[PDB]
């Protein structure tokens, strides 16, 4: 229940959940020992990853997946896939005959780990490139500002 909503049991790898025989009830206070890591480059691996119990192999903090390569800001346009979103990266392409520009957007798909609750659309998101982890996806979500006007 709660977590295990799938056909297979959803255990984090790495950590064994089984060595125990002492007094003061069954298991500890925290009960499980959660595996997480820090993801580097100066990024705060958040509370909701480490505190929280959820499980995702495609979490850049609490699962197997190296951030390594390009780092890109976008802005979240949809959230309708499960554990993944689409971000629209917009940019003024230069044409040089007319010493002018043209606007251009590339809505790349992106993996949003559910360390991040309470992310909305129109929210600036900084993705880190990683290994291809869907047919389209190559970017995990690393930090989300959301502060574009609408409230704290």
């Amino acid at each position: 229940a709660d977590i295990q909503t799938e056909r297979a049991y959803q255990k984090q790898p790495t950590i064994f959940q089984n060595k125990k025989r002492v007094l003061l009830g069954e298991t500890g206070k925290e009960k499980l020992p959660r595996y997480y890591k820090n993801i580097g480059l100066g990024f705060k691996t958040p509370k909701e990853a480490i505190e929280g119990t959820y499980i995702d192999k495609k979490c850049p903090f609490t699962g197997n997946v190296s951030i390594r390569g390009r780092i890109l800001s976008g802005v979240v346009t949809k959230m309708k896939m499960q554990r993944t979103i689409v971000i629209r990266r917009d940019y003024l392409h230069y044409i040089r005959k007319y010493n002018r520009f043209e606007k251009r957007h590339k809505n790349m798909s992106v993996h949003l780990s559910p360390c991040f609750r309470d992310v909305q659309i129109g929210d600036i998101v900084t993705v880190g490139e990683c290994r291809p982890l869907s047919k389209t996806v190559r970017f995990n979500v690393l930090k989300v500002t959301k502060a574009a006007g609408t409230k704290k």
Partner: protein
Amino acid sequence: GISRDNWHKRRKTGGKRKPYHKKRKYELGRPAANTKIGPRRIHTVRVRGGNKKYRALRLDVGNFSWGSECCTRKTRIIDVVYNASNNELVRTKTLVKNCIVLIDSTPYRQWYESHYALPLGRKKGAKLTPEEEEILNKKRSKKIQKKYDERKKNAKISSLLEEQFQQGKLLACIASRPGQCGRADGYVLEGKELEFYLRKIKARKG
């Protein structure tokens, strides 16, 4: 032939990709192992760069590990019980990774009884009278009993497992990828997981 490659399916948008080359021996697949249970049968394959891939085809022994207890005897793969992917693999009885098989309890049993000096799997008085007394009978005294008394409220195995042994197979999950490795090694379902897969199986029986 039976190929793996991106080029042959549509894009993000859903256009049709044109092929610029033809199939390439590396953009390549091979027909599956789907190794059944039975007497040992492995065919090795040459792969890229030479090297080998040992496709299992039948199998019986598996190097499963009682995690908590840290024993890991090699044991009969007695039957496949559950598989998360697809119910048909269970029905055909096909060993692949993350299956839930059953494995003979016996080598774990034996070891519990030689290590912890208690019994496992309850019985009236056929096992208890001849063998366990002979395993015990402390002609030394002092040291060995002190060690086995130090194996205190500590032996204290789970309720589900103690039950399993007294039946006498273990629920076990496969960690190897038989079709590539050749083996079928795994671990013994314990505690929270075991409880989960028992609840899955009961439901399937209805």
